[PDB]
Amino acid sequence: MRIPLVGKDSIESKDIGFTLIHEHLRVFSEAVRQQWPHLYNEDEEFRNAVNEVKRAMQFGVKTIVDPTVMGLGRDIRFMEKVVKATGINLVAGTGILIYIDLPFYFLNRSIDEIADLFIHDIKEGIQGTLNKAGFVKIAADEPGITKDVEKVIKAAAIANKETKVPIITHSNAHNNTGLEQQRILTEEGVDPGKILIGHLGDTDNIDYIKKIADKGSFIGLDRYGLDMFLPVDKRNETTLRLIKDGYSDKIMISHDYCCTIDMGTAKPEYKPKLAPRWSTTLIFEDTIPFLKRNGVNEEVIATIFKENPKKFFS
Amino acid sequence: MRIPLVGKDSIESKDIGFTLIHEHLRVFSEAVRQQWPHLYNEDEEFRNAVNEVKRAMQFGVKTIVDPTVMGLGRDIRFMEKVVKATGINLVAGTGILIYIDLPFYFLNRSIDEIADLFIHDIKEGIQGTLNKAGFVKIAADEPGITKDVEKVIKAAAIANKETKVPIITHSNAHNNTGLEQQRILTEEGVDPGKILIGHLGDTDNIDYIKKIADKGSFIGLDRYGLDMFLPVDKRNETTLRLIKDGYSDKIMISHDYCCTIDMGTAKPEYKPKLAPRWSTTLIFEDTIPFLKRNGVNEEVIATIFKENPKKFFS
Ligand SMILES: [Co+2]
Ligand SMILES: [Co+2]
Ligand SMILES: [Fe+3]
Ligand SMILES: [Fe+3]
């Protein structure tokens, strides 16, 4: 297939190259930014995103997939400015990130109406531009598969069947929300190989992770650097074990890094070892060197960062 | 006190004149408008608001209080354009309308931080303008007094104690959310006479309505025309009974009219009598004529629409 890119002509999926599948140029709550602009500094957000993207490119990253959608402050014009300043291939998406209920707008509205919003972004363009969405992003977390969460999942299935774009999820690794997302999507006719079940790297429960991979979907070991969810060393051991056991062709690795994010800062926790620097390049500083010196060869690295994204977007 | 007005110098509260205490120039879900602008037409929204405001002014309305805040799409620049086009006195507010949880921005943030946002809008101005907020708006509905709902209530109390602006609420008339809002605010030191408990006209449970008025707060008979909550005739009978029983000095009347609103349309219900035309002038067409021909004198009308707002803002 051809993948739409922000600020560029679309590319063939075979040309995606080395990809970070889950990173955020910027995240914010739409209602807070609209109501209290004094809390934000767009110039700093722009500088932060440009600098992070440039650093990723210096390590060989060719494409970044950014699943900032409704609920996380997607801004296609900000994204296109970052592209112009860096030259990155940037894949933007459509979708909705909620944990409980949809915004009031959606009262009395059908799953088809929700799907039409996603299809609009895929076929016509995002936010009044010709930049088109290349995937759909959906979520579930601690509250489980609520009524409105299910509506969004089913709308993503409709958009995938109509346009063939893949689906990226946010899940909570400690309930079975990821497993439920996969099942609900596949029951609607979505190819399991067109789904990335997100945030599975937040657990060391390898049997749960493997169960989802064995059902055909990519597994998101996608929060490297967020020690609050799982420390880097345990993520590395889980990643290494999955590679040793033959799961390279389902593994996707990223950081979920937010070059800026507006949420309040949680209480710091200090451990014996110096805290890792969460960024878009931590895997080049820590994870990839760790895998290599544990015997993981170059072909595994190419599978995870090139072949798997290529398949996902094919 | 002096009441700040959008696009005008502040006025003494004695000069507020005939007031509609709860009307919306425009409502939308911030995240949906940001992500799917194709669903909206600002020129139509502007025309609708200007035309409604002009009609209200033709019946003698001097001031409109608009409690559109975070969660309902407050836009101070849109409001100031409507003022420029009409000459209305418009009171804008600050606050947050949620039913369950706050946006992700508020994770790990204190009640004091929330109050600081409201105080910023009151003292410094709304959305980067010098238009200042003249009241705080808070909500609770079917989910009851959740953790985050309580946080917003307590933040409104802090803002009221610091700045002396009054508090308008949204409640669900069929639970005791309005009674709970009143109690929580008064326990924090808010004068009950600085509170309007909203949406009480949605019930004909006169004992519940009177209980709140007797605890010192204004009662919002504030959704005239929304037959889905309560039909006009039963609202009129409840209003008349409250007047007959001596409650004029606590009654506030409005329509909650939204000149535009983005929410999906509920299923229509057709009754034997022609449905009333919900607008900002329905009370001049129906309610006020009904009260007068049932013996309600001009002094009652002046109490409800002039003296009560004056007290509320004093
Ligand atoms: Co996520
Ligand atoms: Co309300
Ligand atoms: Fe993310
Ligand atoms: Fe309202």
Curated annotation (Swiss-Prot), chains A, B:
Inactivated by EDTA and o-phenanthroline. Keywords: Cobalt, Hydrolase, Iron, Metal-binding. Binds 1 Co(2+) ion per subunit. It holds the Pfam family PTE. It is an enzyme of class 3 (hydrolase). PROSITE patterns: PHOSPHOTRIESTERASE_1 (PS01322), PHOSPHOTRIESTERASE_2 (PS51347). Optimum pH is 7.0-9.0. The modification N6-carboxylysine is found at K137. It comes from the Archaea. Co(2+) binds at K137, H170, H199. Coiled coil: none annotated. Fe cation binds at H22, H24, K137, D256. Thermostable. Its EC number is 3.1.8.1. It catalyses: An aryl dialkyl phosphate + H2O = dialkyl phosphate + an aryl alcohol. Has a low paraoxonase activity. Also active, but with a lower activity, against other organo-phosphorus insecticides such as Dursban, Coumaphos, pNP-butanoate or parathion. Homodimer. This is Aryldialkylphosphatase. It comes from Saccharolobus solfataricus (strain ATCC 35092 / DSM 1617 / JCM 11322 / P2).
